[PDB]
Amino acid sequence: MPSFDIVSEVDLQEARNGVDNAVREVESRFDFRGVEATIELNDANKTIKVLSESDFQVNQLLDILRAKLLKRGIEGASLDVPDEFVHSGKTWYVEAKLKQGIESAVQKKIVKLIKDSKLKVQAQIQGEEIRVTGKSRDDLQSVMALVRGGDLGQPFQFKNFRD
Q: Write out the residues near ligand C2E by the rule CB under 6 A.
A: 2, 33-34, 135-138, 163
**Residue number closest to ligand C2E, CB atom:** 34
Least distance (Å) between residue 50 CB and ligand C2E: 19
Least distance (Å) between residue 71 CB and ligand C2E: 27
Which amino acid, 42? N
**What is the H or E stretch that residue 157 is in?**
strand 157-162
Q: Where are the alpha helices (DSSP H) in 36-159?
A: 55-71, 104-115, 137-148
Torsion sign over Cα 150, 153, 154, 160 = negative
Nearer Cβ to ligand C2E (71/148): 148
Least distance (Å) between residue 60 CB and ligand C2E: 15
φ and ψ at residue 49, rounded to 5 degrees: -95, 125
> Can you tell me the distance from the alpha carbon of 54 to that of 15, in angstroms, rounded to the nearest whole number?
25
> Can you tell me the distance from the alpha carbon of 65 to that of 80, in angstroms, rounded to the nearest whole number?
13
Least distance (Å) between residue 37 CB and ligand C2E: 11
Least distance (Å) between residue 3 CB and ligand C2E: 11
Nearer Cβ to ligand C2E (39/69): 39
Nearer Cβ to ligand C2E (34/149): 34
Nearer Cβ to ligand C2E (36/63): 36
Nearer Cβ to ligand C2E (77/161): 161
Burial of 89 (0-12, 13-18, 19+ CB in 10 A): exposed
